[PDB]
Amino acid sequence: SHMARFALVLHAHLPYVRAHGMWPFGEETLYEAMAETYLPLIRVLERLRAEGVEAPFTLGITPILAEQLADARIKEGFWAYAKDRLERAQGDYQRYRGTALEASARHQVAFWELTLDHFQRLSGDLVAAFRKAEEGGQVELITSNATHGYSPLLGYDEALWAQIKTGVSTYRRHFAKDPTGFWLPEMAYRPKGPWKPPVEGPPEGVRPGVDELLMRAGIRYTFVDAHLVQGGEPLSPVESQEATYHVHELESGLRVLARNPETTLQVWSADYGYPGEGLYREFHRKDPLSGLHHWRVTHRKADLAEKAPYDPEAAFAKTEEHARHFVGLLERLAGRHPEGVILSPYDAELFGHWWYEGVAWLEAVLRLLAQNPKVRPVTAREAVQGPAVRTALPEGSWGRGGDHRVWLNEKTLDYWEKVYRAEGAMREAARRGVLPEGVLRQAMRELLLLEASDWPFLMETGQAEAYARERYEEHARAFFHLLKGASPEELRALEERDNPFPEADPRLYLF
């Protein structure tokens, strides 16, 4: 009766890593997420469906992630990665039987057996499994920009349109339905108005709001950070004002929900977030021989050398207590905001991958909320129904500082220069229509790959900036090479290396 609406949104995303190397950052990053986040989530969805548990939520799979999950090289690579991990786990069980690490090693063997069997039973097709969960009603699926481009800073409306529409087209191709919800990468939003580029030389002029292009693409709602609706300081101690519990409608007709502060902190806080509980598996200590994780957090301030052996049984059991604790918080929020909306949006790979026990926590939370008299779990589609506050949103993001500083700074000016030059050249090339169709399609792929926010995100990170620079520099170089003139076999080598979006439509740049 007059229940609060809880909208859990998981944003699943990885940049394009297929064919670009294996490790530390490369294909293995995708195989890790497939094993530890996506497959376990699919098993939650299968169980809830089997048991008739009604606790829906919203899942984004970015187009570039979905393109990789659906790819033959990735399916084969995952199968090989999981086989090798089973062998590593068997070897660690051989070494650690009769030691304090035996339980961890035994658990790892069981995990990889289950992973291989499940993957095999899915025909290796995770995208199909997610389509099937949506069909059963356990989840709403949402899309995003083709390659998670940073919407407010893309230099042309045509390039932003191509990102949005390529994402919508990818979702339609994979799921045979039109998406109504959309994840703005980094919750990054810009309203209608005069715009001057931060680097030369897209032109300055009045641009439509990001929401107007979303509406034109058939999208009806998205998700923004608290400070975009309540003002004040960005969440990234920011309280949760009234406005954050309301659905907002913009002049364009688009609806938005705002990130709830309390539920974000309760999970993400480096100091009191659930993942820092001492029983949970420690991510950052790796076995010297196998690279597997056999240790527990122990204490948040513990040195790696001070980490105690992992006990899987105690760790998974702990998730039940944390599920009750979280639901207690939702109830307190529901009492403060009768019949309000609580949006709890997270990067998906936090669960199961970074916080190993986090998918079990999600399942426990959902099962509790299915029976809760005060808080109803809903899809985003349902959450945005009913009365909405008429609202205009300021420019911002959910990043540090609540603005664009993470992606636009002294170390990314070179990046943005290349993006802007490529966006201008792509438009012109599409308009001329003199390059072969295949060259135009692959140039479009290279531009989209260049536009991934994942690269500039890392230009102020010491251990990642060289890698990210080589990735963006290579997609830029490939893009310009294709326009200037590449041989057919140079084209084919790029098509094979960089293969998302088989139906890429360069006519989107004529928007």
UniProtKB/Swiss-Prot annotation:
One of its GO terms (molecular function) is 1,4-alpha-glucan branching enzyme activity. One of its GO terms (cellular component) is extracellular region. Changing residue 457 to A: 0.5% of wild-type enzymatic activity. Substrate binds at residues 259, 276, 398, 454, 463. InterPro entries: 57_glycoside_trans_central, BE_C, Branching_enz_MT3115-like, Glyco_hydro/deAcase_b/a-brl, Glyco_hydro_38_N_sf, Glyco_hydro_57/38_cen_sf, Glyco_hydro_57_N, TTHA1902. The active site is at residues 186, 347. Keywords: Carbohydrate metabolism, Glycogen biosynthesis, Glycogen metabolism, Glycosyltransferase, Transferase. Its EC number is 2.4.1.18. Transmembrane segments: none annotated. It is an enzyme of class 2 (transferase). GO terms for biological process: alpha-glucan biosynthetic process; glycogen biosynthetic process. Belongs to the glycosyl hydrolase 57 family. Catalyzes the formation of branch points in alpha-glucans by cleavage of an alpha-1,4 glycosidic bond and subsequent transfer of the cleaved-off oligosaccharide to a new alpha-1,6 position. The branch chain-length distribution of the reaction products shows degree of polymerization (DP) of 3 to 13, with two local maxima at DP 7 and DP 11. Exhibits an alpha-retaining catalytic mechanism. Is involved in glycogen biosynthesis. Shows a secondary activity, i.e. the hydrolysis of the substrate, being 4% of the total activity. This is 1,4-alpha-glucan branching enzyme TTHA1902.
